[PDB]
Amino acid sequence: LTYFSARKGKRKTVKAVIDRFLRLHCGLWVRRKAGYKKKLWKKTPARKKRLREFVFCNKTQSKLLDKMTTSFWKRRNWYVDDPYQKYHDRTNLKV
Amino acid sequence: KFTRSRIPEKVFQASPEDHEKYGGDPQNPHKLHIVTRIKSTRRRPYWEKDIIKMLGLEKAHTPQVHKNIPSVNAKLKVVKHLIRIKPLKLPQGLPAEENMSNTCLKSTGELVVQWHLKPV
Amino acid sequence: RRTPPLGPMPNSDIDLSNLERLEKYRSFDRYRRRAEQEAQAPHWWRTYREYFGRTQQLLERKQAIQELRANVEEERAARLRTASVPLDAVRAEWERTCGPYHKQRLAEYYGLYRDLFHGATFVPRVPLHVAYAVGEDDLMPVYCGNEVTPTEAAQAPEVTYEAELWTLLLTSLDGHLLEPDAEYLHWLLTNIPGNRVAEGQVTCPYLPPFPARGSGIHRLAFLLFKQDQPIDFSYQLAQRTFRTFDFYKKHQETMTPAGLSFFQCRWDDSVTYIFHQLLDMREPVFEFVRPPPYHPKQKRFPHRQPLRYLDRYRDSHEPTYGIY
Amino acid sequence: KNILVRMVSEAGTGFCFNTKRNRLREKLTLLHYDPVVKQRVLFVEKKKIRSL
Amino acid sequence: KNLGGKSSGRRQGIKKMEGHYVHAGNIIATQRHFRWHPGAHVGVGKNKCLYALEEGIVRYTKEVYVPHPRNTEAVDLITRLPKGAVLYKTFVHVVPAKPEGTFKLVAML
Amino acid sequence: YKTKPTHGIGKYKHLIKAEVRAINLGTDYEYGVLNIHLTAYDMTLAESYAQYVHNLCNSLSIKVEESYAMPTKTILTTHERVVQISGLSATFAEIFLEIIQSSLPEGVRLSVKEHT
RNA sequence: ACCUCGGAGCAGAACCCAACCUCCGAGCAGUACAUGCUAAGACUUCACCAGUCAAAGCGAACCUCAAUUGAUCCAAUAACUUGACCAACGGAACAAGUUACCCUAGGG
RNA sequence: GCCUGGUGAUAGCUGGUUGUCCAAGAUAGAAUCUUAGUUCAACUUUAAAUUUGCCCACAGAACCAAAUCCCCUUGUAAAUUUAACUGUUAGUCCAAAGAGGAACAGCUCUUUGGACACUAGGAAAAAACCUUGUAGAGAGAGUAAAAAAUUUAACA
RNA sequence: ACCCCUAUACCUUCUGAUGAAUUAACUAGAAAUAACUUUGCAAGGAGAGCCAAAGCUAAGACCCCCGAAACCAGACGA
Ligand SMILES: [Mg+2]
Ligand SMILES: [Mg+2]
Ligand SMILES: [Mg+2]
Ligand SMILES: [Mg+2]
Ligand SMILES: [Mg+2]
Ligand SMILES: [Mg+2]
Ligand SMILES: [Mg+2]
Ligand SMILES: [Mg+2]
Ligand SMILES: [Mg+2]
Ligand SMILES: [Mg+2]
Ligand SMILES: [Mg+2]
Ligand SMILES: [Mg+2]
Ligand SMILES: [Mg+2]
């Protein structure tokens, strides 16, 4: 990525990352599964049910996506009727 | 392939000839072993290195007391080529709290609970 | 490294050189028979069962059936398969001959012996008959292991049995509210002359069965005792509680059990009447509570789980707002 | 040899689903299940999508 | 002229050895042909994989094999046997740990 | 498992034989494969007698390889049934043949001819 | 000659294990149209991506095969969906021969 | 062509990277216009939280050898999780089981285990064989491994 | 002092040839996203903007040197 831009001297986000992923405020990245809309005629319904899911990301995938976006994308967002809003705070972890 | 070696049980069954050779009684056997490392764990597999660390025999020529129970005997059977085992014999009793400081394990295998430095 | 088998291996003795000289299972059914026999045998390997477990009679019977097959309408009806059987004769003669062993099976299956006598099995020789009055017309019979409502069992039943003293006992093997071991009796009539019941010494008088709501389905024991020498004995549920084992231990010298009939009860509205009216307490209501569902330990990064994973581990389904 | 065709529901409409059928046999009509009507309904095939 | 054969290991075999506590739905063992058969409280997938249907402890036994009568392969294999010959297989069982619920007092109405 | 005492409890292929001259060596003597032709002007007596032969042979523990029939001939029609047999004893040759002799219904002939 | 996927041996008994190592195969076909929707718990090709199995539930009745395959972007489509022998099969959106004139940076 | 500029061109390649002292630390792999490289993993390191880890006994793991998995006791003291990152990988040889080759190669390719890229003693010299490990001074002592052994043919 | 005994130069590149006559001087690790440590204040922090379900503010602490053939633009050259 660009660590220091030529105009501002700031970091830049990679906009592929924003275009594909969802950062929850607790640090979890949500994604969509690869091939969830390809060749559905030859996939069993169990597999199609698996592909139509919002799948969390790895730890190192998560840290790779944190480094590729900026602090704007890491921020609390109090939207109006947000579908994912109950998934931001992390309930009831025992580490 | 070089693997871990099972040893059959006939190897660990004494004969009356052996009771004549060493000083053992099959009835009323000994409670405590003295184990000493007399060979290196270098050039030995990692499992033998581990068993030597568990039994507390990292330093060679240093005696260690163990129980004569089948668990400890199982670990001893794994590294029986690196060690030396003798029965801990006790001519007088096991040491009381009076004789706790003034002991000495002799070379014979006995543990004397009054260790003066005078001649008899 | 082979270790040799402990006992005999299966398929050893039949293993010969000439299989074609050995006659085979031509069917599926014969293999199922032999196979079930080998299932029931004790083996030395680990099996499922370890973990989850006079002359005049034959004379009159031979002449009786020999006279029975000789009639032409019996053969003609039986070959046209319109012959039937009178169920009543079979019922009463079953009550006579081999009924006691079957009532022994039903008492062993319903756990009356492991609970009522700590495993002391016996045989109900007496063909006892108990029935509860259902109004004035009909009457609900008690056979071994039936379902009878406590409305039907509101009033003490009619007991008829063909015999010649007696002590009759009713208990509720499971209906005990406090102690998980004892049982509330319901009526214990003693020193009974012959086969009339009314002239018995009513020691503990009749309660109806009271199973609590949602506490499942109860079994209720009618013991009937051959008494030799007439002995003297002895709404508070601390007073209806005893155990039939050490009760019978006090009196097993001159008394032996001779009859069973037991039945099931569930809740009904009459049991509301029993708890409130005549016991004078609030009724207890039970519910069958299943154990909470296992979920594994929650991870920081639940890799590849769906988004539903965060809901397995939350406890409120309402928007929490935190410090704001 | 086979064709991937779409099947359009006759009622509770706008619902399609794809099937395979031979190049040579007739135009399929089926009884599939509409989750819009939430019933089994005849579907009629309307267009071949791809000759697999 | 020997092309192909570069397939990797399937990583099959037993996942829960005998004595292991098992929760409901855990895969006990994945096989390619029926090395182990489902016994008590053990289910089978389309891939012949044995999973668990209750929470409990896995046990392996040896049982009499009596196939379904509509299974003409194994049934035709039966009828060729001599008269004492009885087939055995190894089965997997889950001995269920918990009771399936308790009665609990709810209210004194 | 290969080291447990219950190894090979599940084997079965030694219990199925999943697979010609006469054997008359020194003491244990037996015929090879045979052929028994049954010719009659009746389908009924030839078929039924072939049944009686076949049920005798199954009731006396004999390998009966086939029980086919030969085609008929334009003459009246002559019918044939071939019921093969392999393996008899010295006594059992006599005792086996005497019953087939002593059980013929009506004008149906025999053959103890062998293969080819 | 090959490049991806599967079976067997190597690799005898949990898992894994190479080779321009030894032998077979695959790139489909058939049936069904609840091959609907949801969902505990798991396995996993040594990562990831992909893959697999699945009880309970709602709704109904009363899949076989081992492999039988292709990401993202982009297109086409109202939508549902569909799109590569992208086979160099983790795939650059589209680029051949040759240099004893070769040149540079290096390695043997 | 040559010069100046772009220009500190670019270089997965070569070469080089400067005080002290201590500590912990070496060999699975998967993809890749990839095999002179990177990314993920494995291994490694620090910090943190917790609770088990390792060794293992019966029992147990399929039909068509050596062993391993599993595993309470016991002997021990570690392990997992959380946070943060770098680096390393055609290893070599020996013992063993094998494959290719000539049952050649200091040849090629897997597996198990050692050792070496960490010390000292021995084997003539000596990466890899044997003995041996944890660090200093001593003009003390006991040991370990450790030295090749052989010499022949009358005949009735 | 030598004689006695012990002792296969250093760097770098490989699992285990390179460069250096010698001296002096010159000559090669640049970034604070996140985490950690230490303060301040604390449901708030910050000297507007920004973050906040114990956070925020401040500081400390991490990212080398030399080397092509080339390509392009403009000149200077018979
Ligand atoms: Mg293979
Ligand atoms: Mg492979
Ligand atoms: Mg994996
Ligand atoms: Mg390629
Ligand atoms: Mg590729
Ligand atoms: Mg440069
Ligand atoms: Mg480069
Ligand atoms: Mg160190
Ligand atoms: Mg490519
Ligand atoms: Mg490279
Ligand atoms: Mg354990
Ligand atoms: Mg230097
Ligand atoms: Mg001029």
First CA to last CA distance, chain F: 51
A55 interfaces chain C, CB cutoff of 8 Å: yes
* Number of independent structural domains in chain F: 1
Which nucleotide's C1' atom has the smallest distance to the CA of A26?
A: I53
Neighbours of A90 (CB within 10 A): 16
Contact present, F10 and F65 (Cβ < 8 Å): no
A82 interfaces chain C, CB cutoff of 8 Å: no
Contact present, E57 and E41 (Cβ < 8 Å): no
CA of E31 to the centre of ligand 2 (A): 20
Which residue of chain E is at minimal alpha-carbon distance from C36? E64
Place of tokens 């393996």: F87
Per 3-state DSSP, chain B is made up of helix, strand and coil in percentages (nearest 5) of 25, 20, 60
Asked if CATH classification 2.40.50.100 holds for the domain at E3-109, the reply, yes or no, is yes
Asked if CATH classification 2.20.28.120 holds for the domain at D1-52, the reply, yes or no, is yes
Q: Which of residues 285-324 of C touch strand I (CB under 7 A)?
A: 320-324
Q: Are strands C255-265 and C218-227 parallel, antiparallel or unpaired?
A: antiparallel
The residue ranges of every structural domain in chain E are 3-109
F61 interfaces chain E, CB cutoff of 8 Å: no
Residues 59-88 of F with CB under 8 A from C: 61, 63
Give the H/E segment covering residue C223: strand C218-227
**E42 vs C contacts (CB less than 8 Å):** none
CA distances from E96 to E58, E61, E100, F47 (A): 9, 16, 9, 62
**Domain housing B94:** 1-117
For residues E91 and E102, what is the distance between their CA atoms, to the nearest angstrom? 31
* Number of independent structural domains in chain B: 1
Q: This structure's resolution (angstroms)?
A: 2.4
Contact present, A1 and A68 (Cβ < 8 Å): yes
State the chains in contact with B (3 or more Cβ–Cβ pairs under 8 Å). none
For residues C305 and A57, what is the distance between their CA atoms, to the nearest angstrom? 9
Determination technique used: cryo-EM
Place of tokens 């809309």: A37
For residues A5 and A18, what is the distance between their CA atoms, to the nearest angstrom? 19
The residue ranges of every structural domain in chain D are 1-52
DSSP one-letter code for C229: S
The alpha carbon of residue A29 is apart from the nearest alpha carbon of chain D, in Å, by 33
E strands, chain B, are 32-37, 64-67, 83-87, 104-105, 111-112
**Domain housing F99:** 1-116
Structure tokens at C174: 């499971």
CB contacts < 8 A, E to F, total 21
- Strand I contact nucleotides, protein CB < 7 Å: 31, 33-34, 43, 50-54, 63
Q: Does C contact D via 3+ CB–CB distances below 8 Å? A: no
For residues F79 and F104, what is the distance between their CA atoms, to the nearest angstrom? 15
User: Which of E83, E88, E48, E49 shows the shortest CA–CA distance to E66?
Assistant: E88
Q: Are strands E88-96 and E37-38 parallel, antiparallel or unpaired?
A: parallel
CA of B81 to the centre of ligand 12 (A): 46
Subunit contact F16:E62, Cβ cutoff 8 A: no
Subunit contact C284:E60, Cβ cutoff 8 A: no
